[PDB]
Amino acid sequence: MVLYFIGLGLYDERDITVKGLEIAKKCDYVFAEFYTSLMAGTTLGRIQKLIGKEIRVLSREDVEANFENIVLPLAKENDVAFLTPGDPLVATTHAELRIRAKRAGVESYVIHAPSIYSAVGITGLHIYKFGKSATVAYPEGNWFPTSYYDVIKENAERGLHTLLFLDIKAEKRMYMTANEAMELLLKVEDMKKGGVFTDDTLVVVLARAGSLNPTIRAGYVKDLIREDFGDPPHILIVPGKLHIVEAEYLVEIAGAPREILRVNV
Amino acid sequence: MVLYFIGLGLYDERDITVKGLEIAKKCDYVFAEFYTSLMAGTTLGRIQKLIGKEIRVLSREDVEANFENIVLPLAKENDVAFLTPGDPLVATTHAELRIRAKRAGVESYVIHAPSIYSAVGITGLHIYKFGKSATVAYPEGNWFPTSYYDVIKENAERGLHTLLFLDIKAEKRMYMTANEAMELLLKVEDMKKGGVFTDDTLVVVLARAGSLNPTIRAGYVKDLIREDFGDPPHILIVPGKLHIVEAEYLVEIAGAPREILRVNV
Numbered sequence: 001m002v003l004y005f006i007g008l009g010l011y012d013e014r015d016i017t018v019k020g021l022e023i024a025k026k027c028d029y030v031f032a033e034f035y036t037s038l039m040a041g042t043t044l045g046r047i048q049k050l051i052g053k054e055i056r057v058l059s060r061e062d063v064e065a066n067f068e069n070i071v072l073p074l075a076k077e078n079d080v081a082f083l084t085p086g087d088p089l090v091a092t093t094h095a096e097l098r099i100r101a102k103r104a105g106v107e108s109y110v111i112h113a114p115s116i117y118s119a120v121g122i123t124g125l126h127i128y129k130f131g132k133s134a135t136v137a138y139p140e141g142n143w144f145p146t147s148y149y150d151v152i153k154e155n156a157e158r159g160l161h162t163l164l165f166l167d168i169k170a171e172k173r174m175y176m177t178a179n180e181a182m183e184l185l186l187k188v189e190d191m192k193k194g195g196v197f198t199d200d201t202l203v204v205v206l207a208r209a210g211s212l213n214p215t216i217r218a219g220y221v222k223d224l225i226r227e228d229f230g231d232p233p234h235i236l237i238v239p240g241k242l243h244i245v246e247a248e249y250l251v252e253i254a255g256a257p258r259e260i261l262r263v264n265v
Numbered sequence: 266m267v268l269y270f271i272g273l274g275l276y277d278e279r280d281i282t283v284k285g286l287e288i289a290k291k292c293d294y295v296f297a298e299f300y301t302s303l304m305a306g307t308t309l310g311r312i313q314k315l316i317g318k319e320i321r322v323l324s325r326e327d328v329e330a331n332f333e334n335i336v337l338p339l340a341k342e343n344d345v346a347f348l349t350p351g352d353p354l355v356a357t358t359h360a361e362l363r364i365r366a367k368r369a370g371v372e373s374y375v376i377h378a379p380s381i382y383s384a385v386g387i388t389g390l391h392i393y394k395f396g397k398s399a400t401v402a403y404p405e406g407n408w409f410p411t412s413y414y415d416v417i418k419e420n421a422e423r424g425l426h427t428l429l430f431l432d433i434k435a436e437k438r439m440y441m442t443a444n445e446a447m448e449l450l451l452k453v454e455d456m457k458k459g460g461v462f463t464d465d466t467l468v469v470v471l472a473r474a475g476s477l478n479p480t481i482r483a484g485y486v487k488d489l490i491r492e493d494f495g496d497p498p499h500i501l502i503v504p505g506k507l508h509i510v511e512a513e514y515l516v517e518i519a520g521a522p523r524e525i526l527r528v529n530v
């Protein structure tokens with residue numbers, strides 16, 4: 001009689017909220033997608049075990065093209081759940097799926113879960129200081145995406161931090177590293193020459209947020225562009241103007257160069 | 266020897282993650298703070314019952330001034346948990362607490378949970394389009410703060426949405442409603458005449474996010490300013506120009522006027 005959008009969280013199967021688990025356990029059918037993000041600390045098997053149900057994984061086409069044919073039909077006579085990494089409606093187009101549910105006469109509910117969008121708070125950067133977000137997409141063919149560069153520029157001149165989601169090709173199992181994101185940005189800088197992202201730009205890297213020991217590193221591009229941040233997923237952040245307390249955290253916790261403590265008022 | 270910062274999530278005792286619950290249970294001492302925010306859908310009693318431990322509530326002073334005297338000592342020879350509503354370290358001042366742990370020779374780990382910052386994705390507004398965030402504070406005495414008005418102007422100017430946290434008197438249990446927030450903004454507008462917030466401004470109200478039955482409403486100030494959005498907590502959002510898909514969600518899910526499809530897109 002209902003459809004639930006349930007987030008699974010950041011890293012492993014235990015990142016689902018208690019609410020999400022108790023509800024998922026009682027559903028008649030459970031579907032899921034794992035192409036919008038990467039949960040590096042678990043497996044489908046462990047999720048199924050925890051929920052105690054067989055999970056039917058859908059592909060991007062199954063969802064985008066046939067959600068109303070594959071999932072909604074069952075939701076009319078049963079309690080159905082749709083699982084996703086992180087929070088189901090963050091940096092996805094899943095929100096529109098609720099419209100499909102309504103038109104199909106199916107009531108839907110949303111159960112949130114930890115999202116990278118807020119987990120960035122672990123970098124020590126004030127969340128309210130984050131501006132517009134963007135995604136660094138893999139160039140393909142003669143098409144080289146550059147919009148994310150402009151976002152950084154706009155945020156930076158307002159003194160705001162920029163959160164950069166990194167590209168993912170789930171089927172090909174390719175997860176863009178912070179290193180690759182930095183390389184691509186230097187190329188865009190060369191092309192546009194706006195003085196937005198260079199070897200001296202301070203950046204922050206967060207890898208495998210949600211794990212007990214995520215990698216949190218801060219430093220200049222010249223020094224981090226070749227550093228090993230561990231397995232994906234990775235997120236990249238270009239800080240804006242720092243508050244002393246932010247810099248203080250980047251130094252003490254993320255091992256940033258102590259010179260950043262000296263902020264130019 | 267370890268300190269765990271554990272998020273309690275959005276609304277009730279089941280909004281904590283499975284990871285957070287299990288870890289909290291294994292801790293010897295469990296502390297909590299309910300001054301940055303509150304858990305309107307539950308009680309300390311219900312939370313204690315779920316955790317199965319006695320929970321010592323700490324005040325802002327307890328934390329800001331004496332965190333290293335109250336919590337850290339026990340963390341030296343025991344596993345200690347520090348519970349906070351939402352996602353740990355989202356509240357501006359929490360991050361610094363990790364530096365205190367480091368200095369005390371105590372290891373700390375962060376267990377995330379859903380935050381309103383990401384939960385707003387339920388409004389159907391694209392998360393990447395959210396700009397700087399701000400807090401609407403009750404004026405008092407001869408003090409009339411209005412920085413939040415400027416945040417809206419700067420964001421909207423660049424086509425970005427503004428997430429507005431509403432003032433809360435935690436200790437006094439007083440929550441600012443979206444209605445009061447709208448009245449304050451109209452008052453500031455009349456004050457600054459910047460044409461940023463008026464009767465014709467489109468706004469979105471999200472009440473009791475995390476609940477299975479949150480109130481999601483979108484419409485013009487003139488029609489929503491005296492509407493009843495239910496019990497707290499309330500969050501106010503002033504969106505920027507809308508993507509057609511965002512508008513359609515607001516109309517289909519948030520009951521917004523068809524007019525937004527031509528006026529705010």
Ligand SMILES: Nc1ncnc2c1ncn2[C@@H]1O[C@H](CSCC[C@H](N)C(=O)O)[C@@H](O)[C@H]1O
Nearest residue numbers: 037086087090115116166208209233234235
């Ligand atoms: N645990 C994690 N650590 C670092 N980056 C992460 C992450 N989870 C997601 N991301 C980042 O976000 C991208 C997916 S975007 C979809 C995000 C998801 N709805 C959420 O709420 O988190 C990834 O390619 C990666 O760059």
